[PDB]
Symmetry: C2
Subunit: 260 residues, 2 copies
């Protein structure tokens, strides 16, 4: 846990690697969300289309008299309508139990990933600013040192020489104190990048754990849902096949003749 | 069997009723053939469409590393491709085991129905021709009788009167023999309509028996076929759900970090 974050904080570009893992995870959830939604749409079209013809087949068959397997085919057409109804309900429940919690967790992970990336750019910008301020302060001290040296070659003129040496020495000491304070400030920003390093990778690991928790949960519910839908098929056809056994050819024409 | 044909041959319009039953039967098989064919087309579109996205989902997922439930989703996408393949094969077998033998028996029944209708029109036309010939022969005899009477009111003139009476009497006897032969011919055509009556209804009953034999057979094979297709679903989803049990959230990110 805390050991994993350290393995990654030791790696130069661990933050970027962790942030890249989060990008990849979100695209993966995005692709999985898009495939299920496209599949659901195709199944809605299938239910809608097969239910149109099955209903038309029902209206038609129920106006017929003494037709062979008329009741079997009425049941068969009705079974198709029930499957259609089950399909539409399954799609609606999938949009609710799968699409919504996964989509919600994904957008949450994307909002946090985008935030952490900006934070990471900010802390690195602050470090480059501290290094650049330090390079200026170093070059400033070189100049003040050069200045002091120029006033250090070797009584009205003596007092003046001493004054100019003392002033250049004060400016060389202040530019020394400044460049040294810049070293410290750059060291401070360096320790700050290490606080950010741990903070970003630990949060990215906790968010991925959470995402994986939602993904397993909604996948398990999806399988249970589609499993329940797949159960309705075999018993139906075996029952319809069993209904064929007491049918005798010509019995319906014989009923027709007797009715006439 | 032969008793049913008699019940119908006693009924005025039994032939027409039997021929109408055959028309209705063919339209019923036609509607059942059209519904299965339309349904099969919708299922082909469904297989084709879902197999496009499932393949694209496969190409995509197999390029990913350390993604949660990556193997589960590869299996899930692959299952969808297998169902698609099974659907296309089921449609092809339905066109072969259901559509073709039912369509072939239907067109056979329609070719025989159309023949029997023409035969029935022909035998009835022959009867109307015999009745119309009889009505003419009856009116002809009335005229010849009137003629004879006119030559029967009451020696050169006597011999002539006797000759004209004898000739009108010969013509009245020949027109009598003709109208009587027309009664017999109409009676003959009447017995001929009764031969046609039995022949047409017995053949229509045997054709309907045959049609019912093909319909039960191909329906039973259809149910067995679709029953076999419906079996592939439940075990698949319960297995996919079982695969979720050894998955631990964050394990893949942990593998990712260790690989980096």
């Amino acid at each position: 846990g805390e050991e994993l974050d350290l393995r990654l904080i030791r790696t130069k570009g661990g933050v970027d690697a962790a942030l890249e893992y989060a990008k990849t995870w979100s695209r993966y959830a995005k692709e999985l969300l898009a495939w299920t939604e496209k599949r659901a749409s195709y199944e809605l079209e299938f239910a809608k289309s097969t239910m149109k013809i099955a209903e038309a087949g029902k209206v038609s068959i129920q106006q017929q008299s003494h037709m062979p397997l008329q009741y079997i085919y009425t049941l068969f057409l009705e079974h198709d309508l029930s499957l259609g109804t089950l399909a539409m309900e399954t799609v609606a429940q999938q949009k609710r139990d799968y699409y919504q919690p996964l989509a919600a967790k994904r957008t949450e992970i994307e909002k946090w990933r985008k935030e952490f990336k900006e934070q990471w750019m900010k802390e690195q910008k602050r470090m480059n600013e501290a290094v650049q301020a330090l390079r200026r302060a170093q070059l400033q001290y070189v100049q003040r040192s050069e200045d002091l040296r120029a006033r250090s070659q070797g009584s009205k003129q003596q007092e003046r020489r001493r004054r100019s040496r003392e002033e250049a020495q004060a400016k060389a000491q202040e530019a020394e104190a400044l460049y040294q304070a810049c070293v410290r400030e750059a060291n401070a920003r360096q320790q700050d990048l290490e606080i950010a390093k741990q903070r970003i990778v630990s949060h990215v690991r906790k968010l991925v754990f959470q995402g994986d928790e939602v993904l397993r949960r909604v996948t398990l519910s999806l399988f249970g849902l589609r499993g329940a839908q797949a159960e309705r098929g075999p018993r139906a056809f075996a029952a319809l096949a069993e209904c064929c056994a007491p049918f005798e050819p010509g019995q319906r024409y014989q009923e027709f003749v007797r009715a006439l």
